[PDB]
Amino acid sequence: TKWDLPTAYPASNLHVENLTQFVKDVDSLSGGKLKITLHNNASLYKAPEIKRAVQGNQAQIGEILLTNFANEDPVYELDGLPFLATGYDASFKLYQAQKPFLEKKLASQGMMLLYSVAWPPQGIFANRDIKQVSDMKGLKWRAYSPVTAKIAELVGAQPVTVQQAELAQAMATGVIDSYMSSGSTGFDTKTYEYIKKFYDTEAWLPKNAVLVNKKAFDALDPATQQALKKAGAQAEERGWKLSQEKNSWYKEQLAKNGMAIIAPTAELKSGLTEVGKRMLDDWLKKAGADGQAMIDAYRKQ
């Protein structure tokens, strides 16, 4: 059996490095009965397209950024809310709280959640001095999701969505001067050529998820199914591992390259916390009882 797996990120990206090992694990564990071809850097499907591609079984498996789908259902927005889970442990616990509801929602559309891994803690790339939220008014902001567009609007920035595959170009032509993302993305797009500061706000840790079409899964023999699930579990473990481990490497490498890595003032964090509380209120209202259940489970961990 041959499957195709689109990802929106380049070969050098930590999630794709992990996906590369994952496809090798599926081959090895399934004894070669399942071969997955990776289509990287949005070459086959682009970020906004991948969930629909797997839903229709155009690709049997695919990697998405959960928060790209925040407008479709509140469950997708959760790991993009600022100042709710601001480290790897809190992020993993938020994930565990979210997971049953993510799986339920995906199941309603004929998909399975294979594994999910957090991007590194999100900071602000800017050329400006930002000591408080007001210092962000009027920023030419690059969003990578609906939620990150909302955050921009809430700080008075002016966002435009640009996928990572188009980010280097958007910076090089000056359409955007600032954004929130990881040291990972900053490094991989050589953001240091155009933008000189990264405020290490660790505001959230958004996850990617590898989704599988249920019908495609069901067509496989039991051993091959189990090989895929085991490869999936190994991928989750390794992905969280590599995400956290490389985070310090990217920050120090960005510094090597002339970027100022700056811890946020208490004032900047408090202002963004206020934005976060507003967004969580809004989210609870959209999400209803399921939102409350998720937040309760997260707060119990």
Ligand SMILES: O=C1CC[C@@H](C(=O)O)N1
């Ligand atoms: O850290 C991240 C989250 C999504 C991706 C991006 O900037 O598009 N990099």
